[PDB]
Design a protein around this ligand. Structure first.
Ligand SMILES: Cc1ncc(C[n+]2csc(CCOP(=O)(O)OP(=O)(O)O)c2C)c(N)n1
Ligand SMILES: Cc1ncc(C[n+]2csc(CCOP(=O)(O)OP(=O)(O)O)c2C)c(N)n1
Ligand SMILES: [Ca+2]
Ligand SMILES: [Ca+2]
Lengths: 806, 806
């Protein structure tokens, strides 16, 4: 679970010391200098004679506009941390404020600790400035390469979901969450403000949202800075916050008055938070209004007010670089030089180029430093789950009655397994869902926990399984669920969320950003320890969406996740749960895995159970497997056709087609694919099937009929250099469907058992089986006409049991 | 432009008549009856003796919980429309309230008009009930098949973006926008409330948001119904709304008092809207507070209060069906029978099964009916754009100087073209962008229009190109931009939005839902006229994202859009703008197209111009084309290799590789692919290249080196059955990159000119060219080491001009 770090929720009981404020003002100057040096300078960091245009980088990359505001806030937060011993993680929402994050880590000493070549002297400072956003250096954003980041904030709008995920079951953790005022215009951010209705001030930590109201986004004003101050305050009060406003930099107040004013307001806010935390030790049934800070400052604060007659400080014109080419004109170089000198670096750095002791003597030390807090490197906190014994949940009836027995709902099995994970791993495992946990059949967890709800309660007739604390969280937002879980994992804990398949697409871009985090971490950031995997139960899938119908039918999550499978990163798992015993095997592998995004595509409809758990674990280790109990070919040369399937509904239709083929005497081989990346090119993926293993399973030369759960294009693209790939005939979802019966869903997508039987006969000999082929095609129209007439599927479809069942 | 319909913004100046309210109450009863009949009944709609369990559908599909609330609102809105002659489109946010939408269209007469077999008598009523969510019938949601829908509301959260898009440049249009209170938890909905800062009450219409606060989503309470009433009101007032609350159904108030109370509140709200509209004829500089309605009613209102001892009315238990199987138990059938009888259908329907005249005598008539308003079938409003003459914008310097001339930014050309579209098509064309219009270089439109901004103005030093009305709208939300545009198109107008490539993924699920709308429309809904295409400029793409770096590098929009290309729908266009003249040809085709989603992938970096406009139009008609001016093979049998490219940066690297190959004497053929679906299987796509056309371009048997803009998996999947496809060697984005130089981006993804030159020689003869191959690989490391040392790319890279340039 989360470590208790420091002395949390302590009031100061004194004014902020004038010395600490002189610390904060020097911090802001030197962090601003170091932010500018990283953007503009390739050499001569301390502007020794001669400082000329040759010291300027040839291409200016990075963002000034948000940066001096972030440096201000970070300076004051560091003072706060050292004075109070508070366990603190910062969410840098305007993540293009990269130079502030790297400057912080350089000043707190964690940068040189982590990156020993970047020393705390003039040659290390030169390397520090050159490397920023440079070929072979470090990124422009607050990337996972930076000590202290858990959030790159490249794609905007997840700051608050990540902040609130971080504090769940983390009652000593304080998260100051800096939100762009442009970022507050996004969808995901806008709903993220309501997360305070889903956290509990006793059992969870505290988020302080900080609205970086600098007035501007890239080229536009921001909505929230142009509405009235009364509207802006009512808005935050309507969302359960008590808003505090700070305004600075729009007049000629000296910088030391600003710091005193801010430290006074910070400590007032903090006294309000400590009151909330102290009250919650007794009463955590009544939701407080949490503080939030509206930080109103000019964009690009302390850049030159006018460059070439255009307003730059307090404008969108300061967003990227205020000064656009200091290398090309003497005039513009002089502006850069005077700007760099306005921070007076002669007082900040000593003769050797180290930042002076009195600049940083207010800073926190040890694990309380922003770049050294374990919650910001949450792999160091994370332990293996205590997992229950997987055979306790095994469907034993396959071994009793035969492969293909029963009408179980496979996700109920996962639900019972996850219930006992939650029971064995209190405060360490969570379930998230967008109001779909019961619907996706995971509600056995309510026997051991509750849905965390901190809005109003009204009646025990409606409010079953809800409590102000609990390990299940539901809000109708895929962005919230994915974002909560992502930060729960990045801070060292574990979990799962579930979703209807077609709505996974809502968070495709969040999955992309989590995968780029993971890809960069496993390629090049070894000091960042492995975090628990992002586990996604994909249920209510396309084949059993014949009640919501056509516009809820999109299995396309698989195509998205296949674009993050390169260079042996192995950060993606794509798993088709064939039945409940395969779902168990998959779930245990995903629950033991680290540094991944695991998609688990499982049906929740009643379906057969095909495998025992020991067979499921064997198929899962390779990824695909022949089912010799289902083949009537007895090796690869007497097979006429290979019937392969990936997914529970393709497996059902292929197994029903193999029974009709067997009745015709045909010699075939049956294959199941549980793990989709096992089919990936053996050159590209060293966990995938070797080409010899692939040709034993599939064959060297026989026609393979392949029923696939998602778009056939996924498979055709993956097997492009596999042996015998020209003989594959992939059937997937093909954008057909309506609100209809289950048979009609498989029929219109050409994956029903009769079409698959017919396709196998056309592949073997379309001419000797011509009579029986015309017979199967006529039945397809007749079983559809039965559904129209009677209101339910034809009994040859619905009553079918595999002949292996005794 | 939008038609002025009716007598807009007229006050009533009288109380609502008691007769009209008696109409509304009968409407609600019969719409509730017809909603239940559609869910439960397969036969005997008017429960003639004998009404037994055989009349009940075998499988119950659909949603009761939202429905009686929607029927209430729709009844009162119909009364409003007939009394005021207001041009009105409803957005049904809880779109799973399908039976309300179909019941409305059946009652207003537009259903039988559109669907002549569904007559207004007892046999038509039987067909009406059976067809709902049934095999071979109609969908469960408010689908495009329903007269009156412009929004299916399957995937939740776009109700307000669509409402506000609908009213843009539509000053007579009133849009009552019904928002689920669960739907209000989503990201896209939460930011959609701020859209009132982007509309102008003179030049645009009026949205009335209606929060369907029924207290419950699927299985949970809703956040907004469990916070305090003071918080809920402050929230809406903070977002620029004046909230009104209506509460009904939680006591024993008779239904006629409820209707009177509601009609009084409706007319008060409407008098406030008419005041806003009347004020805006004089002062449209000051943003009003728009009304909004909080409609607080029990979920499942008028269902039986308790079923089997569980609270059903006013619970999440009424969400899908209150009564779960009326076909299986005598007890549950009797509950259904008494429920159906509580509406007293004997007073609603006459002897023949027609709804009685006095039920519907309050209804609107003609084009003012919800299902007959042209804004709900916006293809009937839409005209061809007046498009300017495309040769006025042609880069003529290709013909002067040679193929490969210049350093133009291709999107500036599109920007000038779109400027003059806007100028020629006032109030008919809009640009949307998520604060990226200038950045994607489309800012020539500010010469003829402004960015529409209706929040506060502060200074001419920051507020350039902004006005309270204008044809460009910017908010930092891809959900808003995509959703605004989608409704502007569905109401008959035209436009374009632009985005950075990697953030297109933010709205993948909105693109999916628009594509399913389009797919269903072109397959089976001929009365729904073609709308203008959804045009998306995809710029700042993966190759020139070496300043934001790795986590902004995702070209994966192409893989998403390839999953919507089936069954000859042709609702997707995927276009790679090779240069500015190809961008013109693409843009004109997309601006003339109907019923599509067009992705236009164009670079905004300085690049060469390869084609004249007349050549670009020739390549675009087929989709791919050989470049005989660039080949040194003079037919297909003397080519040793085929150098193909799709995208401007792959084209640049392939053209630079062909110059180095030419210097070696190699005989090659150069191919450009502008239209990605031209490569799709000729069986699957009858607009794609025939197999004979494909083998003339690519060859029957030569090695094809293919540099592709996005993931190589897209292409490998598409060409799986094309001639010579085993000889393709696709190079795409392979998830490598950092913040770096442009050369280093192409180098790490194995698509740079030196690697491509080397791959061509390995494909031709890896053994005779072994010396020169080892030479090219060593230069790749040396040009990377140059960038590290100097800060900019090697001059052999940066200074290259194609030898065709004179
Ligand atoms: C989802 C998304 N769309 C677009 C962008 C491009 N972008 C980067 S910074 C930025 C402006 C950010 O504004 P704010 O949130 O206002 O940041 P700050 O001013 O503090 O720099 C935008 C639009 C983005 N990062 N994310
Ligand atoms: C983006 C998305 N996620 C999940 C769902 C599944 N879903 C359908 S209805 C529904 C509840 C809707 O609630 P509300 O908005 O509260 O609708 P109403 O009560 O009026 O039925 C949910 C979660 C959805 N439709 N869209
Ligand atoms: Ca800002
Ligand atoms: Ca609701």
């Amino acid at each position: 679970t989360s470590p208790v770090i420091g002395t949390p929720w302590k009031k100061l009981n004194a004014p902020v010391s004038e010395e600490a404020l002189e610390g904060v003002d020097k911090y802001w100057r030197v962090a601003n200098y170091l932010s500018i040096g990283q953007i503009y300078l390739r050499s001569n960091p301390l502007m020794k004679e001669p400082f000329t245009r040759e010291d300027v980088k040839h291409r200016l990359v990075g963002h000034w506009g948000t940066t001096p505001g972030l440096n201000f806030l970070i300076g004051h937060i560091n003072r706060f941390i050292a004075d109070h011993g508070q366990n603190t993680v910062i969410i840098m929402g305007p993540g293009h404020g990269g130079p502030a994050g790297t400057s912080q880590s350089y000043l707190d000493g964690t940068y040189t600790e982590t990156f020993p070549k970047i020393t705390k002297d003039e040659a290390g400072l030169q390397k520090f400035f050159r490397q920023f956003s440079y070929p072979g250096g470090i990124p422009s954003h607050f990337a996972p390469e930076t000590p202290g980041s858990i959030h790159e904030g490249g794609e905007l709008g997840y700051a608050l979901s990540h902040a609130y995920g971080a504090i769940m079951d983390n009652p000593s953790l304080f998260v100051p969450a800096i939100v762009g005022d442009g970022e507050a215009e996004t969808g995901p951010l806008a709903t993220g403000w309501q997360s305070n209705k889903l956290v509990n001030p006793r059992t969870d930590g505290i988020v302080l949202p900080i609205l970086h109201l600098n007035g501007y986004k890239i080229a536009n004003p921001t909505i929230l800075s142009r509405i009235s101050d009364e509207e802006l305050h009512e808005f935050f009060h309507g969302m359960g916050y008590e808003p505090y406003e700070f305004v600075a930099g729009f007049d000629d107040e000296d910088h030391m008055s600003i710091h005193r004013r801010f430290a006074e307001l910070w400590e007032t806010i903090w006294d309000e938070i400590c009151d909330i935390k102290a009250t919650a030790q007794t009463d955590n049934v009544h939701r407080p209004f949490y503080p939030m800070l509206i930080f109103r400052t000019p964009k690009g604060w302390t850049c030159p007010k006018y460059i070439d007659g255009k307003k730059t400080e307090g404008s969108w014109r300061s967003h990227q670089v205020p000064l656009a080419s200091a290398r090309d004109t003497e005039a513009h170089f002089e502006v850069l030089k005077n700007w760099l000198e306005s921070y007076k670096p002669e007082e900040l750095f000593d003769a050797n180029g180290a930042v002076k002791d009195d600049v940083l003597a207010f800073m926190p030390k040890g694990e309380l430093r922003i770049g050294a807090n374990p919650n910001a490197n949450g792999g160091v906190i994370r332990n293996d789950l205590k997992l229950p014994n997987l055979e306790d949940y095994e469907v034993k009836e396959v071994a009793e009655y035969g492969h293909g027995w029963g009408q179980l709902e496979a996700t109920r099995t996962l639900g019972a397994y996850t219930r006992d994970i939650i029971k064995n791993n209190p405060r360490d495992f969570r379930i998230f869902g967008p109001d779909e946990t019961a619907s996706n059949r995971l509600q056995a967890s309510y026997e051991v926990t509750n849905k965390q709800w901190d809005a109003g309660y009204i009646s025990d007739e409606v409010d079953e399984h809800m409590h102000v604390s609990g390990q299940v969280v539901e809000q109708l937002s895929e962005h919230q669920m994915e974002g909560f879980l992502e930060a729960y994992l990045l801070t060292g804990r574990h979990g799962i969320w579930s979703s209807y398949e077609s709505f996974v697409h809502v968070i495709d871009s969040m999955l992309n950003q989590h995968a780029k985090w993971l890809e960069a971490t496993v390629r090049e950031i070894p000091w960042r320890k492995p975090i628990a995997s992002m586990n996604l139960l994909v249920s209510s899938h396309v084949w059993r969406q014949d009640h919501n119908g056509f516009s809820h039918q999109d299995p396309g999550v698989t195509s998205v996740l296949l674009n993050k499978c390169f260079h042996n990163d192995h950060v993606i798992g794509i798993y088709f749960a064939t039945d409940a015993n395969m779902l168990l095997a998959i779930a245990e592998k995903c629950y033991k895995s680290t540094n991944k995004i695991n998609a688990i595509i499982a049906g929740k409809q009643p379906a057969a159970t095909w495998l025992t758990l020991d067979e499921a674990r064997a198929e899962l280790e390779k990824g695909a497997a022949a089912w010799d109990w289902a083949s009537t070919a007895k090796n690869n040369d007497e097979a006429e056709v290979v019937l392969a399937a990936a997914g529970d509904v393709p497996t059902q239709e292929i197994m029903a087609a193999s029974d009709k083929l067997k009745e015709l005497g045909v010699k075939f081989k049956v294959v199941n694919v549980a793990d989709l990346l096992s089919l990936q090119s053996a050159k590209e993926n060293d966990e995938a099937l070797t080409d010899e293993e692939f040709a034993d399973i599939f064959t060297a030369d026989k026609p393979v009929l392949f029923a696939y759960h998602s778009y056939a294009h996924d498979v055709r693209g993956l097997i492009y250099d596999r042996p015998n790939h020209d003989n594959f005939n992939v059937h997937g979802y093909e954008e057909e469907g309506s609100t209809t019966t289950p048979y009609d869903m498989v029929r219109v997508n050409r994956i029903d058992r009769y079409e698959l039987t017919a396709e196998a006969l056309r592949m073997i000999d379309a001419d000797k089986y011509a009579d029986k082929i015309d017979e199967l095609e006529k039945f397809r129209d007749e079983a559809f006409q039965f559904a129209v007439d009677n209101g339910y599927d034809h009994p040859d479809y619905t009553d079918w049991v595999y002949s292996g069942v005794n």
